[PDB]
Every structure is written in structure tokens, then in C-alpha cells.
A = this chain, B = another copy of it.
Amino acid sequence: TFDDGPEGWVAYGTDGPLDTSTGALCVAVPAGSAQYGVGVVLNGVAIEEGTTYTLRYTATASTDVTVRALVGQNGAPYGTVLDTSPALTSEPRQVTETFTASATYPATPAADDPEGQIAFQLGGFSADAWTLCLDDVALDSE
């Protein structure tokens, strides 16, 4: 499902850009990365307070590592409506997370009101360099 590319998704703090050549979106986390310093991110995610969503995704890491998968503000104060700590390994795991939104995020950045985003932050969790691959990422309301 990344076989046509990121199509909106971007990464930052990675060694080289993201790679979708395999069909999955993959990124190389630099060794010695900093918390909040490396991420794979989709901005422009509108969220309605009270609505229930399920975030789905399949991921792999080339070292056994726990990271952070979230839905939140793209901008100060970086509030979250989903905040998790997925443990990842070599073998694909499908994560499914259901939540009811505790806040509203606009589809576009406004004054005092950053757009929402889906974020996988990857930095700071392992001293070592490692690779994350992502596939089958979906987010919908219930």
C-alpha cells in the first residue's frame, strides 16, 4: 500500500529519505538519535472530539525496539488524542488501536490550532542504527 509512494507521508531526521521501492514505506533511523528527532508523519488529519477512530498499521524494526505511535497536534503544545508505545521486531506485527478523540484538530493549520497528524516517532529509543518498515496504514472513524 506504499507501492505508489508516500502520497502525503513525509519523514524527518532519517539517514537518507524514506523508501517505498519495496511496497512498504521504510526509513533508516540514525544511531544515537534524539527523542522527537526522527519521525514518519502524515499531516492534515482532521479529528473531531467525541468521535471514535481506529488506527491500523503493520510495522517491522531491524532491532527489537519500542517506539511511539500517536495521533496529535502538529505544533505546540503537541497534545495527543492517541498516544502509544508499540513494541516492534523483525517479524511483521499488525497493530490496531481504537480511541475516542478527546480533542478537535482542524484539517489545516489555523491560529492557536495546529492541524492534526498521525506520527511514528522513532528517535531516542535505541542507541543503535536501525530500520523501520511500515505497511497497511489506515485510520478511520467508527
Contacts and interface: CB of A to CB of B under 8 A. Distances in A.
Nearest to A1: B140
A107 B140 contact: no
Interface of A: 3-10, 17-21, 42-47, 107-108, 115-116, 139-141
Nearest to A46: B5
B6 A7 contact: no
Given A7-B8, A141-B3, A107 B44 contact: no
The 4 closest A-B pairs by CB, nearest first: A8-B8, A5-B46, A5-B107, A6-B44
Contact of A7 (B17, B21, B45, B141): B45
A45 B42 CA distance: 14
12 contacts: A4-B45, A5-B116, A6-B8, A6-B44, A6-B46, A7-B8, A8-B43, A8-B44, A9-B44, A18-B107, A18-B108, A20-B107
A4 B42 CA distance: 12
Contacts of A107: 5-6, 18-21
A42 B9 CA distance: 10
Nearest to A10: B44
A17 to B, nearest CB: 4
A93 B128 CA distance: 52
